[PDB]
From TrEMBL, chain B:
This is Structural polyprotein. Provides the signal sequence for the translocation of the precursor of protein E3/E2 to the host endoplasmic reticulum. Furin-cleaved E3 remains associated with spike glycoprotein E1 and mediates pH protection of the latter during the transport via the secretory pathway. After virion release from the host cell, the assembly protein E3 is gradually released in the extracellular space. Acts as a viroporin that participates in virus glycoprotein processing and transport to the plasma membrane, cell permeabilization and budding of viral particles. Disrupts the calcium homeostasis of the cell, probably at the endoplasmic reticulum level. This leads to cytoplasmic calcium elevation. Because of its lipophilic properties, the 6K protein is postulated to influence the selection of lipids that interact with the transmembrane domains of the glycoproteins, which, in turn, affects the deformability of the bilayer required for the extreme curvature that occurs as budding proceeds. It is found in: Host Golgi apparatus, Host trans-Golgi network; Host cell membrane; Host cytoplasm; Host endoplasmic reticulum. The lineage of its organism: Viruses, Riboviria, Orthornavirae, Kitrinoviricota, Alsuviricetes. Interacts with spike glycoprotein E1. Processing of the precursor of protein E3/E2 into E2 and E3 results in a heterodimer of the spike glycoproteins E2 and E1. Spike at virion surface are constituted of a trimer of E2-E1 heterodimers. Interacts with 6K protein. Interacts with host MXRA8; this interaction mediates virus entry. The interaction involves 2 adjacent E2-E1 heterodimers. The chain holds residues 266 to 324 of 1248 of the full protein.
Automatic annotation (TrEMBL), chains D, E:
It is found in: Host Golgi apparatus, Host trans-Golgi network; Host cell membrane; Host cytoplasm; Host endoplasmic reticulum. Coiled coil: none annotated. This is Structural polyprotein. It comes from Chikungunya virus (CHIKV). The precursor of protein E3/E2 and E1 form a heterodimer shortly after synthesis. Disulfide bonds join C49-C114, C62-C94, C63-C96, C68-C78, C259-C271, C301-C376, C306-C380, C328-C370. Acts as a viroporin that participates in virus glycoprotein processing and transport to the plasma membrane, cell permeabilization and budding of viral particles. Disrupts the calcium homeostasis of the cell, probably at the endoplasmic reticulum level. This leads to cytoplasmic calcium elevation. Because of its lipophilic properties, the 6K protein is postulated to influence the selection of lipids that interact with the transmembrane domains of the glycoproteins, which, in turn, affects the deformability of the bilayer required for the extreme curvature that occurs as budding proceeds. It comes from the Viruses. The lineage of its organism: Viruses, Riboviria, Orthornavirae, Kitrinoviricota, Alsuviricetes.
Length: 145, 60, 100, 382, 382
């Protein structure tokens, strides 16, 4: 019995959507298009939503080392290691699942999410986003105690 | 008892008539049924049952 | 992405990972400064390792709340009234001062 | 016997009170205010949080004209754009060159964060004053928690306590207050349905569970870019996010009289303002008759060491002639001097050592040991 | 165009207001207050109800001495009775003739009834005034619900309404109130921990779900009857049961200005006190230019029937000569006379019938139909 195998990803799919900057300021139909950046977390954690699906393969199976994106008409598999998040400098990715990414980012004015496909071709999406998280408490510190 | 809707009928949300593998059998029909129950309190009970696949031609 | 022309306002909903939740954040407490005294006056030698917020108020009718972010080595001269003075240095518990 | 005294409304200061019931040996009671709580009655007007701009997929009607309809949703915006020709990866989305329309629609509702990240707008009225008092009664510390209204009678070990009424009716809270987690702010917040864009109250929800919300975010839909499927818009940024950085210091930091501010429930703790009357109805059994106790005569006082400070910097040696052995209460008859000892054991022609606190450089005070007074002359140093 | 008027704060009375925008045909608006709600902000201090005296089976220690221990329970009472010899149906319960003790114990807690039968003690502060207004606007009745603070702008059919501020800040509610089901009482209730035996507050619970309660019921355990197993006691009867019969008439019956009192939420409805200013920003489209409106000439008025009363006891027939067909506003130019009709349809050389109300026996008044005035002479009967 596989009565506990509820997989919502069998019904859903990664997609191509508008991105204003796919690199060098030019717009494209991006397989890593930025949908929404959430910054309600006072600890500074960013909840990022993209057009692709992380941790899912084309056959709908769950694999944390894999990523699925829309390649022209059909979805294709890509490596999780190739996925990156950056503002003014690289971000620390804390969690990935489906359309969602958790990231700890340094101060910036833009937000970029990208990956490397099967053909070794890099794909990225840049959106203007002011990131300067407020101080937790009364001391501006760097590392977590 | 939590009730869901399918055309002219009412049924228990956790028990749609398409079971097992609702989506594998009829993908369009399953999604249409789920869309019709989006406002129903037992929508997530229906989503769980419709997107679960434990086929007959299997040992476990 | 454009809406499907054939179907109307037809939609479904799915649960998402990583929801927002209330937790606890651990913050460091700045080292206690070197404190010297004078007539209705308190002198603190602040040595911050990172930007540290210094705040103070009189414990009487006129609190006169003042605040400043201390970036580096700074000596602070504060007047302690008869009613008393409350000083908060970063994440430390407030220090209270009274004249003898 | 009812003993009535008045102490300043200051927490962490032990006060000595001399109970003198006629024909009974003097009794010294130490009283210390542990906490003074001012809890106002709150009435929730609304809650505010970060808003969410709900934008579904735009309706691109190929070879036709789309129609906007009035939807009863907060900040509902609808616009039909003519002469559109959008493109997808594999080419043009529409068959027609001209006569294609894009229906852009949007509305405002509470963000997913509203359950976790929110500020509550309360109407604060007539606070009930409460006090926690430590009493050194019969060599033991007793705790009395009572409303400081001068009516609430609290009985601990047969001693009836009536605390207050407070000399000052002062509160650090105004008529309208705003609460965010552990912080309280005095704010004349906008009423429900009067919130401004990009300011506190741009989105207003009467309760956190409320389905319908008020929204005034200045949401305006814009014409999409040439050959692009998207819903561009102009909107004033989150008023709650703006308030979080513009709020300034909370009441815990700005309030006069050294007020400590706590939440769950919202209360003012240890506001050092005015004085507090104390009524203690001490039972019959607690007292010892003068005859049951000792009679003191030929009393003399010497101060070999004194320093005028906040603590007991003074030392006094009192010589006496006691009629019999027993326990005697020690109390200062001068309010400018306070004694550490509340009770000492006496026996015949002997001497006692007490610790005293004073702010005076030249301290002249009277010490009552049992029912006899002795004058102490002290030259206290800085 | 902003039309500003002031009406008395009286519900169920239709008032006629003449809107005269320069260069535009006069407009008559009928306004009626449907309800005026005064809802105070409540802060629950505690709840009270019938108490329950919990008495378990007494501990009858045969051939031994039982020992009482201090239990942290409300009104905890414990007493050990010596020299007991209790009997059951089949004889003596104890083997020993002497040296048997009975430990009687009791405590007070909330009764099972406390969820159903209870009174709530609230701290009531600064009430928010709200008004429901019926406006006869463009031949249709529109309902406007707004806060009577003179700030809350409510737009219905493009007409912006600003109600208040109220001329009177009067409220039938005091600082401290008590609520029982559908009844509200002005009561200076005892604070928490200050309740007296046999009176309102003998038992006090901060919330209805609260595990720990305050109790002062004067519970005293008595020595059991000879050879009898029972726990006799003396206690002051239920303070809540006593208050239920001693409360008197509620605010719904005692409040001045004909106040109606409702619960869930606690509010004062239709308190006939002071006046209420009304601001109406009538849109451009609602108005008709004088030139675009019919012109009336050769006007005459006849009153065939009149009775001077509170209602429309007068009948008037007005003859006219209209330049064109259209709608004309009807208004009394004399404040001592009021007309039921706000708008009538005119056409050439015809006549109109109106209903009027007056207190005068000899009523001489002017009626403005569109932009022309006509004098009416009326002999009204008692």
């Amino acid at each position: 019995s596989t009565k506990d195998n509820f997989n919502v990803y069998k019904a859903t799919r990664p997609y191509l959507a508008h991105c204003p900057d796919c690199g060098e300021g030019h717009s494209c139909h991006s397989p890593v298009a930025l949908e929404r950046i959430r910054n309600e977390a006072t600890d500074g954690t960013l909840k990022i939503q993209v057009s692709l699906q992380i941790g899912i393969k084309t056959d709908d199976s769950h694999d944390w080392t894999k990523l699925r994106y829309m390649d022209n008409h059909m979805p294709a598999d890509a490596e999780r290691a190739g996925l990156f998040v950056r503002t003014s400098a690289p971000c620390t990715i804390t969690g990935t699942m489906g359309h969602f990414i958790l990231a700890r980012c340094p101060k910036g004015e833009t937000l970029t999410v990208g990956f490397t496909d099967s053909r070794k071709i890099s794909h990225s999406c840049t959106h203007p986003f002011h990131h300067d998280p407020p101080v937790i408490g009364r001391e501006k510190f760097h590392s977590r105690p | 008892p939590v009730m869901c809707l399918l055309a002219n009928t009412t049924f228990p949300c956790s028990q749609p008539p398409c079971t097992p593998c609702c989506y594998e059998k009829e993908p369009e029909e399953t999604l249409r049924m789920l869309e019709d129950n989006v406002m129903r309190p037992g929508y997530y009970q229906l989503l769980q049952a419709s997107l679960t696949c434990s086929p007959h031609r299997q040992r476990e | 992405v454009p809406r499907n022309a054939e179907l109307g306002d037809r939609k479904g909903k799915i649960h998402i990972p990583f929801p927002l939740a209330n937790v606890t954040c651990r913050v460091p407490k700045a080292r206690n400064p070197t404190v010297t005294y004078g007539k209705n006056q308190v002198i603190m030698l602040l040595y911050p390792d990172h930007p540290t917020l210094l705040s103070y108020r009189n414990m009487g009718e006129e609190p006169n709340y003042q605040e400043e972010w201390v970036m580096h080595k700074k000596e602070v001269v504060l007047t302690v009234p008869t009613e008393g003075l409350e000083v908060t240095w970063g994440n430390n518990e407030p220090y209270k001062y009274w004249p003898q | 016997y009812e003993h009535v005294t008045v102490i300043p409304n200051t927490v962490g200061v032990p006060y000595k009170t001399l109970v003198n019931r006629p024909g009974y040996s003097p009794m010294v009671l130490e009283m210390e205010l542990l906490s003074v709580t001012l809890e106002p009655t709150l009435s929730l007007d609304y809650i505010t949080c970060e808003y969410k701009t709900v934008i579904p997929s735009p309706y691109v009607k190929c070879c036709g004209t789309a129609e906007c309809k009035d939807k009863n949703l907060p900040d509902y915006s609808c616009k039909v754009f003519t002469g559109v020709y959008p493109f997808m990866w594999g080419g043009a989305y529409c068959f027609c060159d001209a006569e294609n329309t894009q229906l852009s629609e949007a509305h405002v509702e509470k963000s997913e964060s509203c359950k976790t990240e929110f500020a509550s707008a309360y109407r604060a009225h007539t606070a009930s004053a409460s006090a926690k008092l430590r009493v050194l009664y019969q060599g033991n510390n007793i705790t009395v928690t009572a409303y400081a209204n001068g009516d609430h009678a609290v009985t601990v070990k047969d001693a009836k306590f009536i605390v207050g009424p407070m000399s000052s009716a002062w509160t650090p809270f105004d008529n309208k207050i705003v609460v965010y987690k552990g912080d309280v702010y005095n704010m004349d917040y906008p009423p429900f349905g009067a919130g401004r864009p990009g300011q506190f109250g741009d989105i207003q929800s009467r309760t956190p569970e409320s389905k319908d919300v008020y929204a005034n975010t200045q949401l305006v839909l814009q014409r999409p870019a040439a050959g692009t499927v998207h819903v561009p818009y102009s909107q004033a940024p989150s008023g709650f996010k703006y308030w979080l950085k513009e709020r300034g210091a909370s009441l815990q930091h700005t309030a006069p009289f050294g007020c400590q501010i706590a939440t769950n429930p919202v209360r003012a703790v240890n506001c050092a303002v005015g004085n507090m009357p104390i009524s203690i109805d001490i039972p019959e059994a607690a007292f010892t008759r003068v005859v049951d106790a000792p009679s003191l005569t030929d009393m003399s006082c010497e101060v070999p060491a004194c320093t005028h400070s906040s603590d007991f910097g003074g030392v006094a040696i009192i010589k006496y002639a006691a009629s019999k052995k027993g326990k005697c209460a020690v109390h200062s008859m001068t309010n400018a001097v306070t004694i550490r000892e509340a009770e000492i054991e006496v026996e015949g022609n002997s001497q006692l050592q007490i610790s005293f606190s004073t702010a005076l450089a030249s301290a002249e005070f009277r010490v009552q040991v049992c029912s006899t007074q002795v004058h102490c002359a002290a030259e206290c140093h800085p």
